[PDB]
Paper text:
Members of the family of the Tri Longin domain (TLD) Rab-GEFs (guanine nucleotide exchange factors) act as activators of a subset of Rabs that play a critical role in late endosomal biogenesis.
We then produced an equivalently truncated complex CtMC1Δ (CtMon1 141 to 665, CtMon1ΔN; CtCcz1 1 to 796Δ361 to 460, CtCcz1ΔL), which expressed at an improved yield and also exhibited higher stability than the wild type. The orientation of the CtMC1Δ particles on the cryo-EM grids was tremendously improved in comparison to the wild type, allowing us to obtain a three-dimensional (3D) reconstruction of the complex with an average resolution of 3.85 Å. The quality of the map was sufficient to build an atomic model of ∼75% of CtMC1Δ, including all Longin domains of Mon1 and Ccz1. The three Longin domains (LDs) of both Mon1 and Ccz1 are triangularly arranged and form together the backbone of MC1, which has a pseudo twofold symmetry. The respective LDs (LD1-LD1 and LD3-LD3) share a large interface and form two continuous cross-subunit β-sheets. The two continuous β-sheets are a defining structural feature of MC1 that results in a two-layered complex architecture. An electrostatic surface potential map of CtMC1Δ reveals a large positively charged patch stretching over LD2 and LD3 of Mon1 and a negatively charged region on the surface of LD1 and LD3 of Ccz1.
Residue numbers in the entry:
A (entry chain C): 11 to 54, 94 to 155, 181 to 359, 460 to 476, 490 to 496, 530 to 583, 599 to 624, 646 to 667, ...
B (entry chain A): 195 to 323, 333 to 457, 485 to 663
The structure:
């Protein structure tokens, strides 16, 4: 009879939206409930309204209260016994309020948070989704309001947020250690071999890519990533590569981070959206539907857009190596689309087999490290993710809870930990490089 | 951190209220008492005029949450942390700007609650809800220790003074032959360090009971500002929902001071207890133990260099999970030339501020950390780096100089436990008599 720790209510409100009581009702922009999730979950009253507006009223009181003590503006986390409440400022006055209902364990009536997702990474998760949301609508959310108007934002905001919260599992799932940082996931090979003059593995294949952005018209930058394995020639033909599941560490890392014309801050967004198509196949904002004419392709110029200050995206899909071809706003003519599709399938045809082995390159009983660089945002990761129901499921709950527990404490600087069954987590800072010499046994 | 030396001083109450609140606004620590109705009862660093205006928000915050069947637990905002404790009609809230975890404040606020209950028994505690007639100075001085660091309450244990097993046993025996039929349990203390314990066959001295006696006498009140022999009532959580238990406190003189604690469950036992001390002083002076107690108490906190030769460890701290007690090393070893009170106060506060993160790190929510190491390397000052280690059977803390590393502590930590284990009989009391 254990009740899972389902999400409670999540609200998006602007305190400066309404300065009067008649306009104070409209401060909420998006609201979610367990009942609201039910309609969207299958896809993948007046007194009720009073409680919604009243509860955010404390939040504006709470932030004003603590702002005057420590000059620290936000009351980031509100701790209760039934619902763990978090508060994050996304961009200069817009606040997201979330209430994670704890793991109800009726001991006839008991509570616990042994596996509830700790608030250290939801701020990273909510900022991820918000930055992911900003990748589909406008440059900045504040400027988005001035363009589309208040009424239009709610429809668009409800369209995306209801989708994300429909499956935002508030539990230690995936790779929380990588999720705490923003980061760019890098595969086993990581970034390709730089420079010309050495063969090595995966070195000269950048020149064709760095030359690709020159020959084809209006290409600003492309990124690739080995989410899948080589084409499986087993019994089943398709393997349904896009579908349910989660990204796998040390394997899903994006490669060929870019060439230019994309800021490192907004280069994280395109990779994160590129993560979504693999994790949520055919079901992502914009609804990517694969083209039957060319099976190794997706989306295609023929509405959808990416805001990095306005690149129209097209998706080239091999079983590994999802290609995010970012084309300019105007220069590619949509009329001549089919000619470019055949050329692109032909230009990128010889980059399937040589690139497959190239990315297969790899650089005290067991050691797992993790390198995060501040200025370039690259995330060289090795920590395995929690398996679904190399370790067992129960163990990684504690290991990934302790790894990010000490990260919040710090932010030389070396730290160390240990556990009864045997671990040695070391966080070290030196360019500032954050090495996590996580060991075991 | 920086303004700590001027932080402990009270509000001047000679300047306009505008910047008066600002002075209260930024102080490092805050302890508050507010009733279920929202009226603030006690505020330590602030007058009741200051707190009520600002603290009405908290009552407003909890009022919504209590209506929603959600007794609130605590906030956090950047550097400052807000902790809420629920005990009867009274609501306990603490504001901390230091790197203190919620568990640390829960223990600190729990001790404050115990003081209120120790003066007003549980049946009257709920019905009565100023109310805290004589505990105002008791609570105000207790919060001073928490700001100063409180290695005892933070660790939730008691100190001991270095007396050999035979010498300590002789004190217990001479403290037991002189017994009357109204000693529910009695204590002997010198400079805040427990010396001996006497217990009856059936009644047990719960270790949580001892912290009531020590906190109100040897840490906060200073034996209620001396005054000589005192006979005051008491309430104990073990002997709850009963009448005020009666405790006898008097200086054992003819820090240096040594005090004697005797407890009786009857009103008319004062003369017997007073006669009990009179026969006790004569025998202690006859043997000479009292003269020995002052010398050991005065020369407390043994030097770490004398404890361990050629060891660079700046400090030590130890605990035992069973038979709850607590040990320590020298504190005046930070800098011998330093004599002014301002650097020795910051030396203490920083020293426990080194352990304030460590205790939080070890005690987390089912995280099961065993060994914790860190390094608070200053940009230009020094390479002061902390240490740390633990066990389900005992707890150990350490501090090391710029010469650091795992071998920088494991070369010594494995034997500082042995020294505590070697000196366990002369530093920890297994039981009374």
């Amino acid at each position: 009879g254990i009740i899972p720790a389902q999400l409670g209510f999540l609200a998006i409100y602007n305190p400066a939206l309404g300065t009067t009581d008649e306009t104070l009702e409209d401060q909420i922009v998006y609201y979610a409930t367990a009942s609201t999730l039910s309609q969207a979950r299958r896809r993948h009253s007046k007194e009720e309204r009073h409680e919604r507006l009243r509860q955010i009223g404390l939040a504006q009181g709470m932030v004003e209260f603590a702002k005057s003590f420590s000059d620290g503006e936000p009351v980031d986390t509100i701790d209760t016994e039934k619902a763990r409440v978090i508060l994050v400022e996304v961009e200069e006055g817009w606040w997201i309020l979330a209430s994670i209902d704890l793991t109800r364990l009726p001991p006839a009536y008991e509570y616990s948070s042994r596996e509830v997702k700790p608030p250290s990474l939801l701020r990273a998760d909510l900022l991820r989704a918000y930055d992911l949301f900003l990748l589909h609508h406008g440059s900045s959310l504040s400027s988005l309001l001035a363009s589309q108007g208040r009424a239009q934002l709610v429809a668009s905001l409800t369209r995306f947020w209801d989708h994300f919260l429909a499956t935002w599992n508030v539990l230690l799932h995936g790779n929380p250690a990588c999720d705490v940082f923003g980061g760019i996931k890098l595969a086993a090979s990581g970034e390709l071999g730089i420079g010309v003059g050495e063969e090595e593995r995966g070195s000269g294949e950048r020149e064709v890519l760095e030359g690709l952005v020159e020959r084809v018209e209006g290409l600003v930058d492309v990124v690739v990533g080995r989410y899948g394995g080589p084409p499986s020639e087993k019994g089943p033909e398709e393997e349904q590569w896009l579908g349910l599941g989660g990204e796998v560490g040390e394997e899903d890392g994006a490669v060929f981070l870019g060439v230019g014309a994309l800021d490192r801050k907004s280069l994280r967004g395109v990779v994160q959206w590129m993560e979504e198509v693999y994790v949520w196949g055919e079901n992502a904002f914009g609804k990517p539907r694969r083209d039957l004419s060319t099976g190794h392709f997706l989306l295609g110029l023929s509405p959808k857009a990416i805001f990095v200050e306005r690149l129209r995206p097209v998706i080239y899909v091999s079983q590994p190596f999802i290609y995010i071809l970012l084309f300019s706003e105007i220069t590619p003519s949509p009329s001549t689309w089919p000619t470019l599709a055949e050329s692109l399938h032909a230009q990128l045809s010889p980059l399937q087999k040589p690139l497959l082995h190239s990315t297969s390159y790899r650089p005290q009983h067991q050691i797992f490290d993790l390198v995060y660089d501040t200025e370039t945002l690259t995330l060289q990761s090795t920590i395995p993710n929690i398996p679904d129901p190399i370790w067992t499921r129960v163990e990684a709950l504690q290991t990934h809870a302790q790894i990010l527990a000490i990260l919040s404490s710090g932010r030389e600087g070396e730290r160390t930990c240990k556990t009864a069954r045997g671990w040695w987590i070391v966080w070290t800072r030196v360019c500032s490089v954050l090495g996590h010499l996580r060991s075991v046994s | 951190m920086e303004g700590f030396e001027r932080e402990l001083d009270n509000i001047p109450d000679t300047l306009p209220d505008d910047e008066r609140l600002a002075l209260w606004k930024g102080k490092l620590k805050h302890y508050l008492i507010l009733s279920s109705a929202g009226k603030p009862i006690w505020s330590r660093h602030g007058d009741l005029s200051l707190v009520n205006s600002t603290m009405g928000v908290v009552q407003t915050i909890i009022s919504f949450y209590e209506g929603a069947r959600n007794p609130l637990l605590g906030f956090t905002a950047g550097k400052v942390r807000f902790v809420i404790l629920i005990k009867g009609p009274l609501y306990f809230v603490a504001i901390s700007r230091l790197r203190e975890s919620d568990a640390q404040l829960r223990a600190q606020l729990e001790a404050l609650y115990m003081q209120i209950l120790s003066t007003l028994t549980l049946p009257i505690l709920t019905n009565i809800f100023g109310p805290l007639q004589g505990t105002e100075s008791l609570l105000a001085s207790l919060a001073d220790s928490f700001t100063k660091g409180s290695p005892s309450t933070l660790l939730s244990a008691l100190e001991c003074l270095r007396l050999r097993k035979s010498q300590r046993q002789a004190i217990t025996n001479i403290f037991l032959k002189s017994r009357c039929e109204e000693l529910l349990y009695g204590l002997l203390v010198a400079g805040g360090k427990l010396v001996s314990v006497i217990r009856p066959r059936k009644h047990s001295l719960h270790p949580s009971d001892l912290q009531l006696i020590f906190n109100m006498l040897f840490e906060s009140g200073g034996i209620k500002g001396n005054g000589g022999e005192n006979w005051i009532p008491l309430c104990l959580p073990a002997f709850n929902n009963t009448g005020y238990l009666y405790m006898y406190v008097s200086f054992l003189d003819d820090d240096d001071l040594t005090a004697l604690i005797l407890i009786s469950p009857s009103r008319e036992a004062f003369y017997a207890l007073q006669s009990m001390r009179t026969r006790l002083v004569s025998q202690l002076l006859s043997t000479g133990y009292l003269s020995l107690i002052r010398s050991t108490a005065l020369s407390g906190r043994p030097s770490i260099t004398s404890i361990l030769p050629k060891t660079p460890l700046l400090h030590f701290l130890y605990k035992s999970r069973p038979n709850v007690q607590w040990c320590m090393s020298s504190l005046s070893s930070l800098t011998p030339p330093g004599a002014t009170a301002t650097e020795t106060l910051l030396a203490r506060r920083k020293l426990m501020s080194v352990y304030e993160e460590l205790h939080a790190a070890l005690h987390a929510r089912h995280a099961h950390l065993r060994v914790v190491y860190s390094t608070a390397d200053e940009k230009e000052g020094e390479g002061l780096a902390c240490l740390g280690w633990s066990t389900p059977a005992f707890e150990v803390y350490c501090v090391a100089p710029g010469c650091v590393g795992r071998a920088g502590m494991a070369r010594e930590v494995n034997r500082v436990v042995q020294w505590a284990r070697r000196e366990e009989e002369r530093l920890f009391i297994l039981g009374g008599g």
